[PDB]
Amino acid sequence: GPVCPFRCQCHLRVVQCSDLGLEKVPKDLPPDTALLDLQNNKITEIKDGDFKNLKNLHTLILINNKISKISPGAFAPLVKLERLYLSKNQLKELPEKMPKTLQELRVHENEITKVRKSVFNGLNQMIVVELGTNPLKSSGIENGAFQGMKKLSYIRIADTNITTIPQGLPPSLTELHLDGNKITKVDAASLKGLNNLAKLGLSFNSISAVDNGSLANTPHLRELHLNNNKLVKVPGGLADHKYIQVVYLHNNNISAIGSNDFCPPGYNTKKASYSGVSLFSNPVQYWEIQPSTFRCVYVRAAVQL
Amino acid sequence: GPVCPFRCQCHLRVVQCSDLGLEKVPKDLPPDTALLDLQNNKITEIKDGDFKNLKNLHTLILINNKISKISPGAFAPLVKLERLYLSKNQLKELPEKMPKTLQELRVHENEITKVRKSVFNGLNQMIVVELGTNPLKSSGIENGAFQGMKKLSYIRIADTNITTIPQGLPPSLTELHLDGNKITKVDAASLKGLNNLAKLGLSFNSISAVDNGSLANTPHLRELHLNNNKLVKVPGGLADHKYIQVVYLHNNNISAIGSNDFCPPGYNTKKASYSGVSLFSNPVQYWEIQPSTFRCVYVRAAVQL
Numbered sequence: 001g002p003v004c005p006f007r008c009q010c011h012l013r014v015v016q017c018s019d020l021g022l023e024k025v026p027k028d029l030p031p032d033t034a035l036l037d038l039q040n041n042k043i044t045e046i047k048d049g050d051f052k053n054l055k056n057l058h059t060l061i062l063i064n065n066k067i068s069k070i071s072p073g074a075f076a077p078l079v080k081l082e083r084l085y086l087s088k089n090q091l092k093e094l095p096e097k098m099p100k101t102l103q104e105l106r107v108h109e110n111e112i113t114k115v116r117k118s119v120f121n122g123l124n125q126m127i128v129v130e131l132g133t134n135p136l137k138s139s140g141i142e143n144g145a146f147q148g149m150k151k152l153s154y155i156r157i158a159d160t161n162i163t164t165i166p167q168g169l170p171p172s173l174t175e176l177h178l179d180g181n182k183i184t185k186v187d188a189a190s191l192k193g194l195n196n197l198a199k200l201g202l203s204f205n206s207i208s209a210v211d212n213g214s215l216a217n218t219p220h221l222r223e224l225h226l227n228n229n230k231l232v233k234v235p236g237g238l239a240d241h242k243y244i245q246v247v248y249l250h251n252n253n254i255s256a257i258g259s260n261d262f263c264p265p266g267y268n269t270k271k272a273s274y275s276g277v278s279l280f281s282n283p284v285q286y287w288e289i290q291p292s293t294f295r296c297v298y299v300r301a302a303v304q305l
Numbered sequence: 306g307p308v309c310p311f312r313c314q315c316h317l318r319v320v321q322c323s324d325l326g327l328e329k330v331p332k333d334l335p336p337d338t339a340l341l342d343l344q345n346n347k348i349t350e351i352k353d354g355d356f357k358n359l360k361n362l363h364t365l366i367l368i369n370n371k372i373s374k375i376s377p378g379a380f381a382p383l384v385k386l387e388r389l390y391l392s393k394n395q396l397k398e399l400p401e402k403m404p405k406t407l408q409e410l411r412v413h414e415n416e417i418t419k420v421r422k423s424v425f426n427g428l429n430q431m432i433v434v435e436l437g438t439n440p441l442k443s444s445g446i447e448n449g450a451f452q453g454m455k456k457l458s459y460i461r462i463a464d465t466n467i468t469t470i471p472q473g474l475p476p477s478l479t480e481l482h483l484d485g486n487k488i489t490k491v492d493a494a495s496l497k498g499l500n501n502l503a504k505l506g507l508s509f510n511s512i513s514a515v516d517n518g519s520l521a522n523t524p525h526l527r528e529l530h531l532n533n534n535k536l537v538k539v540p541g542g543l544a545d546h547k548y549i550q551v552v553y554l555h556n557n558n559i560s561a562i563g564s565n566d567f568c569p570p571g572y573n574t575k576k577a578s579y580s581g582v583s584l585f586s587n588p589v590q591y592w593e594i595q596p597s598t599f600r601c602v603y604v605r606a607a608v609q610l
């Protein structure tokens with residue numbers, strides 16, 4: 001029969017092996033295991049036999065190991081796998097042939113420099129991907145790499161070397177989080193087809209420009225965080241956009257605000273009302289903003305100067 | 306209504322906020338939240354209002370933050386809390402007035418130097434405690450500190466400064482893991498009353514002696530790991546013990562093995578059969594062990610010299 005490794009706790013389909021200095025994945029675990037916690041050990045690779053007879057496993061936590069190598073399909077026997085947590089390891093690339101049931105993949109704080117389309121092909125249950133804190137550059141992401149994920153709703157690539165928004169992002173996305181990178185411009189083509197995008201996080205980059213037409217490509221966008229960048233003007237298209245409600249622009253280089261930067265000239269009843277606009281920590285001062293500029297805002301607390 | 310903090314994912318009673326550099330616990334989370342994941346942020350303290358209206362919370366993950374301070378009872382509003390994970394933080398002591406529903410407490414890799422009985426009083430649902438990787442000394446553990454936990458089944462104190470087995474341990478214990486400390490002796494009094502103890506992990510200490518009578522105080526002990534210590538002889542009492550099956554003694558200073566070190570002189574049918582005995586990496590050599598010494602072992606693979 002199955003064995004609980006010495007010091008681990010195996011109770012009610014949970015195998016708890018965190019904090020033990022283990023050097024490889026334990027074998028002979030109970031076949032009905034639903035959650036496997038191997039956080040904070042010293043595992044250095046995942047080999048082909050590591051995950052056999054764990055056909056009920058829905059969660060695998062490998063956070064904070066020393067993994068620098070994963071055999072292709074090492075995870076494929078995990079036919080019910082939904083969550084794969086690989087953060088705080090030493091991966092250079094994403095694992096190939098992950099189980100098609102996968103819903104969430106976390107690879108925060110690795111050494112990832114290449115993101116291949118192939119890793120993601122057929123991963124049609126994937127809803128969330130977290131890839132931040134990696135030395136990754138824009139050249140390292142194949143165009144349309146994330147396109148094979150037809151239900152993908154959330155992606156975050158944060159605190160990396162990327163300099164442009166990835167092209168060919170899946171149109172199912174509702175959240176795109178690209179905070180703390182080295183992005184210098186928002187181009188319209190990267191946002192093309194993102195008609196379900198609700199949130200766009202571009203905070204803490206070096207953005208100096210938003211292409212005209214950019215935001216019209218995210219017609220249902222509701223929240224736009226562009227604080228802590230190098231903007232010299234408010235992004236074009238806010239007045240004509242019908243869904244935008246939250247626009248953070250604090251800590252930028254904006255020296256003037258024109259009268260139709262936020263509001264169209266005539267009250268447009270089809271345009272959603274602003275709930276939050278931040279403009280503080282910019283060269284423009286409250287006394288340089290024409291009163292009319294926020295005529296379409298009716299909650300006075302919404303605008304923060 | 307409730308708010309999902311920007312970049313977090315709130316889905317099906319799970320609030321996923323890992324890897325965001327957050328500096329405090331988010332407020333206004335959905336009231337039905339069952340699991341809250343705040344792993345890998347920059348939270349520096351838990352204040353009194355932090356956990357209100359989270360009455361369905363069963364799991365709280367605060368692993369890998371910078372927490373150096375927790376107000377007494379900050380966690381008490383968490384009336385359904387079962388798992389509290391506080392590993393990889395900067396705590397100096399354990400939180401006071403934890404919820405009485407608590408089943409598992411993990412505080413691996415903190416700066417804990419004092420363990421008070423008071424923290425554990427009334428925690429009668431507690432089954433597992435992990436306290437390893439802490440600068441903790443034996444003087445820092447009040448006598449009988451763990452005694453208030455009447456269902457406690459597992460405790461691990463590993464990779465600390467402790468030099469003796471804690472006294473007044475709860476008699477419900479089935480596992481005691483004290484690997485990698487600075488323990489120098491096994492005294493019988495520390496083991497007194499541990500009649501449910503099945504596993505005893507004392508590996509990687511500086512143990513030079515096991516008091517006679519020690520193991521008789523754990524009458525139902527099945528596994529005893531004493532490898533990587535400074536033993537000069539096999540621990541007394543193994544021949545008379547009726548339950549011991551696994552005895553690891555590799556990497557010690559054992560220079561001789563007497564004929565009744567493991568087996569009683571006459572076959573004792575009430576004594577459980579050895580399944581594993583390790584003796585390699587000791588001064589005694591295979592050619593110095595009288596054949597009869599393992600007469601009560603019938604699986605020849607059991608004994609490793």
Ligand SMILES: *[C@@H]1O[C@H](CO)[C@@H](O)[C@H](O)[C@H]1NC(C)=O
Nearest residue numbers: 133134135136137159160161
């Ligand atoms: C950007 O890439 C270089 C290697 O080309 C790396 O050394 C640097 O730390 C990266 N930035 C980060 C911290 O991701």
Ligand SMILES: *[C@@H]1O[C@H](CO)[C@@H](O)[C@H](O)[C@H]1NC(C)=O
Nearest residue numbers: 209210211212213235236237
């Ligand atoms: C963007 O659009 C605005 C308003 O129509 C215009 O003033 C500006 O010159 C345009 N920029 C470019 C480079 O096309």
Ligand SMILES: *[C@@H]1O[C@H](CO)[C@@H](O)[C@H](O)[C@H]1NC(C)=O
Nearest residue numbers: 230231232252253254255283
């Ligand atoms: C801000 O914009 C001005 C001109 O509009 C320019 O002189 C400057 O280089 C920009 N950046 C900073 C950080 O001041």
Ligand SMILES: *[C@@H]1O[C@H](CO)[C@@H](O)[C@H](O)[C@H]1NC(C)=O
Nearest residue numbers: 438439440441442464465466
């Ligand atoms: C033992 O305690 C001292 C402080 O008295 C500490 O500096 C040392 O690192 C401790 N051992 C460990 C690593 O727990």
Ligand SMILES: *[C@@H]1O[C@H](CO)[C@@H](O)[C@H](O)[C@H]1NC(C)=O
Nearest residue numbers: 514515516517518540541542
């Ligand atoms: C422990 O017991 C053994 C066997 O009865 C005996 O040889 C030994 O001297 C005892 N040690 C002490 C210090 O009582």
Ligand SMILES: *[C@@H]1O[C@H](CO)[C@@H](O)[C@H](O)[C@H]1NC(C)=O
Nearest residue numbers: 535536537557558559560588
């Ligand atoms: C081992 O025991 C012997 C005497 O039996 C002693 O000389 C020595 O100090 C002990 N320790 C080591 C590490 O050899």
